[PDB]
Amino acid sequence: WKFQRYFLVQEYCNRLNIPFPFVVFAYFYMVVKKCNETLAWEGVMKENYLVKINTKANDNSEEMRHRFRQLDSKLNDLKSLLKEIANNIK
Amino acid sequence: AILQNKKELSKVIWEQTKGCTLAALGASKLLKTLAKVKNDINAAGESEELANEYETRAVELFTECYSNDEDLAEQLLVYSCEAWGGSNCLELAVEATDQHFIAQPGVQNFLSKQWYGEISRDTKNWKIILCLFIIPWYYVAFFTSPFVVFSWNVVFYIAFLLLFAYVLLMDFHSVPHTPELILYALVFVLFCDEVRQWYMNGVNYFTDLWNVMDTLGLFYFIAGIVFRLHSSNKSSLYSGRVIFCLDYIIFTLRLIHIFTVSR
Amino acid sequence: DLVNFIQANFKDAFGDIQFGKYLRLSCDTDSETLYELLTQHWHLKTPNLVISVTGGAKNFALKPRMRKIFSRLIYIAQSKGAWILTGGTHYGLMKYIGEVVRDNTISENIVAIGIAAWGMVSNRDTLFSAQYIMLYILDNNHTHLLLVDNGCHGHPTVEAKLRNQLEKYISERTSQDSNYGGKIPIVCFAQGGGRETLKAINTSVKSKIPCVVVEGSGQIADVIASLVEVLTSSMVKEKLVRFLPRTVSRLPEEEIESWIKWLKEILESSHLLTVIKMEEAGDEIVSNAISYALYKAFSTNEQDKDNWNGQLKLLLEWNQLDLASDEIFTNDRRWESADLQEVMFTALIKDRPKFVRLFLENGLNLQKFLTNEVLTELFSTHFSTLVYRNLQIAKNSYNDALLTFVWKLVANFRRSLTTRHPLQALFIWAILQNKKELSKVIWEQTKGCTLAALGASKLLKTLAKVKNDINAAGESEELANEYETRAVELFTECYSNDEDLAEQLLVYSCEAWGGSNCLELAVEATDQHFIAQPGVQNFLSKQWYGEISRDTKNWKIILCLFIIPWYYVAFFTSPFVVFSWNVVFYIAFLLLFAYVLLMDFHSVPHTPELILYALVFVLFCDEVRQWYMNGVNYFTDLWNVMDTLGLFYFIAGIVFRLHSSNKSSLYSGRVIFCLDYIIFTLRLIHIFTVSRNLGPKIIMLQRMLIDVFFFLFLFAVWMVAFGVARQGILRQNEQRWRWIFRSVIYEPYLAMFGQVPSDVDSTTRFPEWITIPLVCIYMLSTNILLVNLLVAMFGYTVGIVQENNDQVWKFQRYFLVQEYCNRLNIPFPFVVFAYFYMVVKKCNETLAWEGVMKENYLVKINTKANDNSEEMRHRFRQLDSKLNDLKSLLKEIANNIK
Numbered sequence A: 001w002k003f004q005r006y007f008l009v010q011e012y013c014n015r016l017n018i019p020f021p022f023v024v025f026a027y028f029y030m031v032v033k034k035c036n037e038t039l040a041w042e043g044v045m046k047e048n049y050l051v052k053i054n055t056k057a058n059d060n061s062e063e064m065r066h067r068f069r070q071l072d073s074k075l076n077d078l079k080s081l082l083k084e085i086a087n088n089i090k
Numbered sequence B: 001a002i003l004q005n006k007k008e009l010s011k012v013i014w015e016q017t018k019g020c021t022l023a024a025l026g027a028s029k030l031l032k033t034l035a036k037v038k039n040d041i042n043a044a045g046e047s048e049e050l051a052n053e054y055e056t057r058a059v060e061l062f063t064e065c066y067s068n069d070e071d072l073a074e075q076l077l078v079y080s081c082e083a084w085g086g087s088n089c090l091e092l093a094v095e096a097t098d099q100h101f102i103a104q105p106g107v108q109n110f111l112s113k114q115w116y117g118e119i120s121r122d123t124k125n126w127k128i129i130l131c132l133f134i135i136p137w138y139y140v141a142f143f144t145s146p147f148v149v150f151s152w153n154v155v156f157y158i159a160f161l162l163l164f165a166y167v168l169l170m171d172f173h174s175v176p177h178t179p180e181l182i183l184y185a186l187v188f189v190l191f192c193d194e195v196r197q198w199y200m201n202g203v204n205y206f207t208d209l210w211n212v213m214d215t216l217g218l219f220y221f222i223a224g225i226v227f228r229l230h231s232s233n234k235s236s237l238y239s240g241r242v243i244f245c246l247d248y249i250i251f252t253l254r255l256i257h258i259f260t261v262s263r
Numbered sequence C: 001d002l003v004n005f006i007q008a009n010f011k012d013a014f015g016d017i018q019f020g021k022y023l024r025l026s027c028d029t030d031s032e033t034l035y036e037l038l039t040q041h042w043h044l045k046t047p048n049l050v051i052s053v054t055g056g057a058k059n060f061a062l063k064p065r066m067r068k069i070f071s072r073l074i075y076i077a078q079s080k081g082a083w084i085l086t087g088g089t090h091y092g093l094m095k096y097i098g099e100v101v102r103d104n105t106i107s108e109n110i111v112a113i114g115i116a117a118w119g120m121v122s123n124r125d126t127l128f129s130a131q132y133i134m135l136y137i138l139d140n141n142h143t144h145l146l147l148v149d150n151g152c153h154g155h156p157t158v159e160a161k162l163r164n165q166l167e168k169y170i171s172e173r174t175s176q177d178s179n180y181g182g183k184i185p186i187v188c189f190a191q192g193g194g195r196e197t198l199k200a201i202n203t204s205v206k207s208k209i210p211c212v213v214v215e216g217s218g219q220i221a222d223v224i225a226s227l228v229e230v231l232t233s234s235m236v237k238e239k240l241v242r243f244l245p246r247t248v249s250r251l252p253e254e255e256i257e258s259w260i261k262w263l264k265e266i267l268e269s270s271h272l273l274t275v276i277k278m279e280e281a282g283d284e285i286v287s288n289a290i291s292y293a294l295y296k297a298f299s300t301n302e303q304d305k306d307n308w309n310g311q312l313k314l315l316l317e318w319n320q321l322d323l324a325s326d327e328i329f330t331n332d333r334r335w336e337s338a339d340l341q342e343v344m345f346t347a348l349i350k351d352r353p354k355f356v357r358l359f360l361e362n363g364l365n366l367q368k369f370l371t372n373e374v375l376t377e378l379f380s381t382h383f384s385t386l387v388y389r390n391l392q393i394a395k396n397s398y399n400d401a402l403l404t405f406v407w408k409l410v411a412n413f414r415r416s417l418t419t420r421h422p423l424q425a426l427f428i429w430a431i432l433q434n435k436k437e438l439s440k441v442i443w444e445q446t447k448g449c450t451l452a453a454l455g456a457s458k459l460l461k462t463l464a465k466v467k468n469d470i471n472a473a474g475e476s477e478e479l480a481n482e483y484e485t486r487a488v489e490l491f492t493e494c495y496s497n498d499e500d501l502a503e504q505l506l507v508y509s510c511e512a513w514g515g516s517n518c519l520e521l522a523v524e525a526t527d528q529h530f531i532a533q534p535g536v537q538n539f540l541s542k543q544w545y546g547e548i549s550r551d552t553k554n555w556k557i558i559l560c561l562f563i564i565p566w567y568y569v570a571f572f573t574s575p576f577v578v579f580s581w582n583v584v585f586y587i588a589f590l591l592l593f594a595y596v597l598l599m600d601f602h603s604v605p606h607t608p609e610l611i612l613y614a615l616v617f618v619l620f621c622d623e624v625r626q627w628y629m630n631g632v633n634y635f636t637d638l639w640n641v642m643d644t645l646g647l648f649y650f651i652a653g654i655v656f657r658l659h660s661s662n663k664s665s666l667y668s669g670r671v672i673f674c675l676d677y678i679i680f681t682l683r684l685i686h687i688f689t690v691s692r693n694l695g696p697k698i699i700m701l702q703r704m705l706i707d708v709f710f711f712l713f714l715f716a717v718w719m720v721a722f723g724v725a726r727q728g729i730l731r732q733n734e735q736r737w738r739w740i741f742r743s744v745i746y747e748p749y750l751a752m753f754g755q756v757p758s759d760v761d762s763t764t765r766f767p768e769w770i771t772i773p774l775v776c777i778y779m780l781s782t783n784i785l786l787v788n789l790l791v792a793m794f795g796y797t798v799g800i801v802q803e804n805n806d807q808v809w810k811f812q813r814y815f816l817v818q819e820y821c822n823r824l825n826i827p828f829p830f831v832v833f834a835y836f837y838m839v840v841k842k843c844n845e846t847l848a849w850e851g852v853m854k855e856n857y858l859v860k861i862n863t864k865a866n867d868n869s870e871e872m873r874h875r876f877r878q879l880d881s882k883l884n885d886l887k888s889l890l891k892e893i894a895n896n897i898k
């Protein structure tokens, strides 16, 4: 119904906004007579949308795995440093 | 990028274009028409998939834009490009026949605002209809809304059908006289309107089956006119009368169209 | 005026450049002059200031990590109306910030000021508003720019002195409006490190102003972020050289010692500096670290440390729940009522639900807080005008009992159980503005929470019906759905816990929450789901059967009705027996009406006809009572309309027969009696709503009737279209149009469905050729099409109704059960005596149990939602933290050993 109603709404935009029986006079009168910022706002909204989809797609799923990876890497580095200092002691 | 089904490059470039929503709709329609081709099957499927993806992208982006702000979104909706394809995003959505894009609340609200015009919504329709007749300046705004124009057109068309029935049933003697002649004037006005419609759209005219029905009714009216005017024999007059009845059948059935307003 | 004053003060070379406002300043220029010029001519005093270090990198990389942070920072500055101080160069981060500010202004309230060097910048036309388009390049995207009137133009910075002096001076001023303690916060933002950036940070420490440094990015910022993690010169020296080989290579050996000394300066004061690591966490980091940076500073002052209120207000303004909850509210010192009264009042306005919950938990008598003055002020000053306009529209168009009640309450408040009900007023205030979290928080504090949930659901639905603005309608609809589900689940839990208390709660009329109980609120919103639940149906069954125990085979009760026509009093009081006797009496009345109409309707009415007058009079009195009870609710039910129409048709027949002027009058009265009989006998179908099997039939029948009504338009169009044709073509002339029409009007309407047209074709040489298409399109093409279309619609309506069976029937049965509650529990024919007797005669604990059940329900949903999912991650986090702490302790003990 909505798609069908679009055409009905469109049809009356082009008219002269006069009742049908009296629009003949308007037609005759016409015959005698003849002879940027919004785009910037759109870009801003696109910025927010792209953030919404990209970050929500990637970071939300990858955060836990990144946390585990960083924890493991940091612990391994600290263990290696402790081994180095222990070797230096002896 | 789009023509060659480069998905990632097209996605990257899309973010850099002003009027991104309009570009998305244009890409959607172009990819659909490309997919219709059958020269090679493999390309058609990738093109169809990319078109679907871009359709969803455009719908979501415009929904977000409208939810953020209303007036700017509405201005963006009708913003005719500098000849991206020569048309705004609404027309591109219509041509691709995206029921989903127009079904979204924002587009429907814009259409409602355009249809009711100055008259505020949340007004019980029966009150407006009553005001139409009880009161037949401030009234100028009331007289400019498309809804009131449509209502008056419906009333005039019903009156014209009533007069046509009266003339055909009772007064169709040899001399036409005023009741039969006034119908000529009315149908002439309708013919002029349809001529204007044809002039505006060279091919778009015959695209709508309603225009075809209107043309057929005009053609059937002229035949009856000629038959009655000749009046060579009573048989000719009777044939013209029957032709009038048939043209009446076509005319009165165009009324069903005005039921598209009602949900 | 202002320009001349500035020129005189400096004693010009300044222009309002437009390709915003550029000016020239001397290195010795007084700082107070700059602040006065900005405040009294161009800008309003700014609660918050941010200083972003510029010039560190000539080229800037638009990395998402480095980009979103600054976008969020600019958004925050716009929200709080802060200043941002940058270099203003065209190349680098300054241009990006300028573009962001420009788009946000396109999307005024945000002010950005740039500081440059008049000697280093390109030549500027002397002053009116000169225009420039293009050794240094300046953006001019910032609204205001200031150049340094250095004696000799030079590449090295010759304006940092003015920047430091200005920031220090601004710190030495007082602004009461801000939540800060009578001072204007000033926080540095060092994301792109460098030499001059390091010098500015070192000077910042001396300035005693907080600085925030980004980690994971920046030339030198990463060095700082790594360094923070006694003081050893080698430790602070080795890392810097390695991280930046080119910078160290270019610089002489004399520069490295100074750099290390400055790093030692940073190490001197760890409190002031703050680090923001972007490797983890989401958006709040941008707004967290900044706020955090401020809090530490507010702690350093002894007078500030003295007062809890400053820190509390600051954290509340910046919305950091954790910091305030842990550091402040864990103090355990006495928390008096007035404190939290003030902080709660300031929290409600700014839409801080979590802080409201925290205050309520820590102890605040909400009933004491919600004074009449507070409520009237809150409804008058902080009530958005758009919501008030929506309320006006809703009352004007979709008026309702609950909506008129709430509008009256709001009107009373604006211009001016216990009677007050303060919590209900606050809950309504929160609901009207679609404050989801605040409404959720307040709902838990209200007695009769289930009733409040249903009321909010209905109110939000009627608000959503409004179309003034689309955006609000959707949020309102969503919130209404959420509250509906909340209420249903809560009542289901309550009933499953206990039966009698739940039933008592169900009919417990409030102290005028809306003037009605929860059952009526559920009915008005038409919540089929709420009434479909087993508890409500069981309550309705108990009310309907009354004393008679359930699990009794209905045929046994029906048999007992007749076989036995004290203990019997209870059997005679159940609504079911009253309904059965009413049905029997109505059937008997219809039988007598048929007997009278068919056989005895002569001129003299006599006893059989008169007794029917008595009976219909009793029915009329009952309907009059029904009308009296409900002023408008009477005509709401279509059944009442049908009853009124039957009464009207009876009176006409009475008058016609009584006149008896002619036999024609008597015959007309008899026919009127038959028509009124048709209406009367069709009201019987209603008593089929009791039966489960036959219940959906009348509703489904009703929807079908609506579909017929809609299809009548199409049918009428077709009827006119082809009747006028047939009249014009088939025959010539007539006794006007009516004669020709009525001649054969019977055929198209009924014969087509009944029998095929036989004589029509025969009755019908161009006319001969043109006749066939007429009839062909007239009947076989369109009529068949239309009738089938109607038939398809009937099939779909029945399908959808029968698909959703056993939910429609329950809601329908509610009305049947309700109707007999109001009666006098007497059979219909004998209730006239009761009516006459009446005419002569005339002239807390449950709420506590409900709260307990709500407690259990809230536990059930909250804990199950959060802890069940978060337990594994919390376990891993705690294990990692404990292992790291133990490893650090082991490293410390190992170092101690050697």
Ligand SMILES: CCCCCCCC(=O)OC[C@H](COP(=O)(O)O[C@@H]1[C@H](O)[C@H](O)[C@@H](OP(=O)(O)O)[C@H](OP(=O)(O)O)[C@H]1O)OC(=O)CCCCCCC
Residues within 6 Å of the ligand: B112, B121, B125, B129, B150, B151, B154, B155, B258, B259, B261, B262, B263, C713, C716, C717
């Ligand atoms: C037999 C000959 C023909 C007889 C005429 C019969 C012609 C005819 O069919 O009109 C009846 C029509 C029915 O009203 P109808 O309820 O269908 O109108 C729409 C409907 O109410 C939707 O439900 C509304 O949305 P929602 O529900 O809120 O979500 C929508 O508003 P919006 O959401 O889009 O804003 C409405 O547009 O009302 C008129 O008078 C229209 C002008 C008719 C001209 C009358 C001239 C006197």
Ligand SMILES: CCCCCCCC(=O)OC[C@H](COP(=O)(O)O[C@@H]1[C@H](O)[C@H](O)[C@@H](OP(=O)(O)O)[C@H](OP(=O)(O)O)[C@H]1O)OC(=O)CCCCCCC
Residues within 6 Å of the ligand: C541, C550, C554, C558, C579, C580, C583, C584, C687, C688, C690, C691, C692, C693, C694
């Ligand atoms: C032609 C003229 C009209 C003829 C009269 C015809 C009027 C008429 O239709 O009644 C038949 C009716 C059918 O019984 P019916 O099976 O539909 O009754 C319901 C049905 O059994 C449900 O299935 C039950 O739930 P469930 O299955 O266990 O889940 C429900 O009990 P509850 O679950 O709610 O507790 C029952 O209420 O039984 C009567 O006698 C009612 C008093 C009628 C008055 C009779 C007066 C003599």
Ligand SMILES: CCCCCCCCCP(=O)(C(C)C)C(C)C
Residues within 6 Å of the ligand: A020, B153, B154, B156, B157, B187, B190, B191, B194, B213, B214, B215, B217, B218, B251, B254, B255, B257, B258
């Ligand atoms: C000579 C051509 C006759 C075509 C008949 C179609 C008439 C349509 C007129 P309308 O659109 C109204 C604007 C008068 C009608 C549908 C109510």
Ligand SMILES: CCCCCCCCCP(=O)(C(C)C)C(C)C
Residues within 6 Å of the ligand: C582, C583, C585, C586, C616, C619, C620, C623, C642, C643, C644, C646, C647, C680, C683, C684, C686, C687, C828
């Ligand atoms: C004078 C008004 C006549 C209205 C007719 C409706 C009668 C309804 C009576 P009932 O409700 C029963 C209680 C007698 C019937 C449905 C069994």
Ligand SMILES: [Ca+2]
Residues within 6 Å of the ligand: B194, B197, B210, B211, B214
């Ligand atoms: Ca047309």
Ligand SMILES: [Ca+2]
Residues within 6 Å of the ligand: C623, C626, C639, C640, C643
């Ligand atoms: Ca009634």
